[PDB]
Design an enzyme around this catalytic site. Structure first.
Site, PDB file in Angstrom:
ATOM      1  N   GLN A  91      -5.964   2.464 -12.203  1.00 19.80           N
ATOM      2  CA  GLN A  91      -6.597   1.238 -11.677  1.00 19.80           C
ATOM      3  C   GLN A  91      -8.109   1.235 -11.943  1.00 19.80           C
ATOM      4  O   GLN A  91      -8.766   2.263 -11.880  1.00 19.80           O
ATOM      5  CB  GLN A  91      -6.402   1.076 -10.169  1.00 19.80           C
ATOM      6  CG  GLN A  91      -5.012   1.411  -9.634  1.00 19.80           C
ATOM      7  CD  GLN A  91      -4.708   0.717  -8.281  1.00 19.80           C
ATOM      8  OE1 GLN A  91      -5.380  -0.307  -7.906  1.00 19.80           O
ATOM      9  NE2 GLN A  91      -3.711   1.257  -7.546  1.00 19.80           N
ATOM     10  N   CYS A 149      -1.236  11.676  -1.776  1.00 20.84           N
ATOM     11  CA  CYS A 149      -0.761  11.560  -3.156  1.00 20.84           C
ATOM     12  C   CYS A 149       0.059  12.809  -3.488  1.00 20.84           C
ATOM     13  O   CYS A 149      -0.227  13.843  -2.947  1.00 20.84           O
ATOM     14  CB  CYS A 149      -1.961  11.477  -4.064  1.00 20.84           C
ATOM     15  SG  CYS A 149      -1.590  11.478  -5.846  1.00 20.84           S
ATOM     16  N   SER A 169      -3.959   1.371  -3.865  1.00 26.22           N
ATOM     17  CA  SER A 169      -3.246   2.511  -3.261  1.00 26.22           C
ATOM     18  C   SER A 169      -3.820   3.037  -1.979  1.00 26.22           C
ATOM     19  O   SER A 169      -3.091   3.633  -1.200  1.00 26.22           O
ATOM     20  CB  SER A 169      -3.252   3.690  -4.224  1.00 26.22           C
ATOM     21  OG  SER A 169      -2.455   3.302  -5.306  1.00 26.22           O
ATOM     22  N   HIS A 225      -9.945   6.649  -1.942  1.00 27.72           N
ATOM     23  CA  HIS A 225      -9.961   7.924  -2.730  1.00 27.72           C
ATOM     24  C   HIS A 225     -11.365   8.616  -2.588  1.00 27.72           C
ATOM     25  O   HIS A 225     -12.351   7.947  -2.378  1.00 27.72           O
ATOM     26  CB  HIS A 225      -9.748   7.674  -4.225  1.00 27.72           C
ATOM     27  CG  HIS A 225      -8.528   6.882  -4.553  1.00 27.72           C
ATOM     28  ND1 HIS A 225      -7.425   7.446  -5.170  1.00 27.72           N
ATOM     29  CD2 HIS A 225      -8.269   5.549  -4.459  1.00 27.72           C
ATOM     30  CE1 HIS A 225      -6.517   6.511  -5.394  1.00 27.72           C
ATOM     31  NE2 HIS A 225      -7.013   5.344  -5.002  1.00 27.72           N
ATOM     32  N   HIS A 277      -8.474  14.133  -6.906  1.00 26.08           N
ATOM     33  CA  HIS A 277      -8.810  13.170  -5.869  1.00 26.08           C
ATOM     34  C   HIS A 277      -8.083  13.556  -4.602  1.00 26.08           C
ATOM     35  O   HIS A 277      -7.147  14.409  -4.572  1.00 26.08           O
ATOM     36  CB  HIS A 277      -8.548  11.712  -6.317  1.00 26.08           C
ATOM     37  CG  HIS A 277      -7.100  11.316  -6.272  1.00 26.08           C
ATOM     38  ND1 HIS A 277      -6.655  10.096  -5.804  1.00 26.08           N
ATOM     39  CD2 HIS A 277      -5.979  12.053  -6.533  1.00 26.08           C
ATOM     40  CE1 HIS A 277      -5.330  10.065  -5.869  1.00 26.08           C
ATOM     41  NE2 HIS A 277      -4.895  11.258  -6.284  1.00 26.08           N
TER      42      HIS A 277
HETATM   43  C1  LIG Z   1      -1.193   9.692 -11.296  1.00 25.95           C
HETATM   44  N1  LIG Z   1      -0.554  10.762 -10.497  1.00 25.95           N
HETATM   45  N2  LIG Z   1      -0.511  11.951 -10.812  1.00 25.95           N
HETATM   46  C2  LIG Z   1       0.142  12.619  -9.854  1.00 25.95           C
HETATM   47  C3  LIG Z   1       0.397  13.985  -9.846  1.00 25.95           C
HETATM   48  C4  LIG Z   1      -0.362  14.839 -10.637  1.00 25.95           C
HETATM   49  C5  LIG Z   1      -0.107  16.206 -10.629  1.00 25.95           C
HETATM   50  C6  LIG Z   1       0.908  16.718  -9.828  1.00 25.95           C
HETATM   51  C7  LIG Z   1       1.668  15.863  -9.037  1.00 25.95           C
HETATM   52  C8  LIG Z   1       1.412  14.497  -9.046  1.00 25.95           C
HETATM   53  C9  LIG Z   1       0.506  11.751  -8.911  1.00 25.95           C
HETATM   54  C10 LIG Z   1       0.056  10.581  -9.335  1.00 25.95           C
HETATM   55  C11 LIG Z   1       0.216   9.244  -8.607  1.00 25.95           C
HETATM   56  O1  LIG Z   1       0.470   8.212  -9.226  1.00 25.95           O
HETATM   57  N3  LIG Z   1       0.057   9.300  -7.288  1.00 25.95           N
HETATM   58  C12 LIG Z   1       0.176   8.108  -6.437  1.00 25.95           C
HETATM   59  C13 LIG Z   1      -1.167   7.823  -5.764  1.00 25.95           C
HETATM   60  C14 LIG Z   1      -2.249   7.525  -6.804  1.00 25.95           C
HETATM   61  C15 LIG Z   1      -2.739   8.546  -7.610  1.00 25.95           C
HETATM   62  C16 LIG Z   1      -3.722   8.277  -8.555  1.00 25.95           C
HETATM   63  C17 LIG Z   1      -4.215   6.984  -8.694  1.00 25.95           C
HETATM   64  C18 LIG Z   1      -5.198   6.713  -9.639  1.00 25.95           C
HETATM   65  C19 LIG Z   1      -5.692   5.422  -9.778  1.00 25.95           C
HETATM   66  C20 LIG Z   1      -5.203   4.400  -8.972  1.00 25.95           C
HETATM   67  C21 LIG Z   1      -4.220   4.671  -8.027  1.00 25.95           C
HETATM   68  C22 LIG Z   1      -3.726   5.963  -7.888  1.00 25.95           C
HETATM   69  C23 LIG Z   1      -2.743   6.234  -6.943  1.00 25.95           C
HETATM   70  C24 LIG Z   1       1.243   8.348  -5.366  1.00 25.95           C
HETATM   71  O2  LIG Z   1       1.738   9.464  -5.221  1.00 25.95           O
HETATM   72  O3  LIG Z   1       1.616   7.426  -4.641  1.00 25.95           O
END
Ligand SMILES: Cn1nc(-c2ccccc2)cc1C(=O)N[C@H](Cc1ccc2ccccc2c1)C(=O)O
Length: 145
Positions: free
Chosen positions: A113, A95, A136, A139, A41
């Protein structure tokens, strides 16, 4: 007429197109569930995001409307082939997954979410969403597996 597709009429041209109210995708062609999917994303945050901060910017101040304009420009560039998704995600996603070209890895239902998850599961492999709003931010979601 797979999960969430309706027929619409172009306001510019009067030609039939197809719109998906789960993914917010739209396309010209007439369209077309697994245990797990893998998505990347590109997130654009705004002043009303849950955490209005990112590796790009300590205090995110843009409005939700400005965030949607940015999202829409990235979608246009990606659909045109002018830029590719991974490249825009690496540069511009608020992100931490930007470092991984937006890749979140594989997930099943019950983890993300709900608007994000529903859109992920309604995309076909290879298919990209329109703008998807969560707490957040906004996307663009690419289903990769
Ligand atoms: C889940 N996830 N994976 C990574 C990641 C993966 C690979 C390498 C580095 C970081 C970062 C995140 C994460 O929670 N990122 C959030 C933003 C986010 C993303 C997926 C979302 C998905 C659904 C709803 C809100 C979201 C909100 C942030 O950085 O504020």
């Amino acid at each position: 007429l797979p999960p969430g597709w309706e027929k619409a009429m172009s306001r510019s041209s009067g030609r039939v197109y197809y719109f998906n109210h789960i993914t917010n995708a739209s396309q010209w062609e007439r369209p077309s569930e697994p245990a797990r999917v893998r998505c990347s994303h590109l997130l654009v945050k705004h002043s009303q995001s849950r955490r209005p901060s990112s590796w790009r910017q300590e205090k995110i101040t843009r409005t939700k409307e400005e965030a949607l304009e940015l999202i829409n420009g990235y979608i246009q560039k990606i659909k045109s082939g002018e830029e590719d998704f991974e490249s825009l995600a690496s540069q511009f996603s608020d992100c931490s997954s930007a470092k991984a070209r937006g890749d979140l890895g594989a997930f099943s239902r019950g983890q993300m979410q709900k608007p994000f998850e529903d859109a992920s599961f309604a995309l076909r492999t290879g298919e990209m969403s329109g703008p998807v709003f969560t707490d957040s931010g906004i996307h663009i979601i690419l289903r990769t597996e």
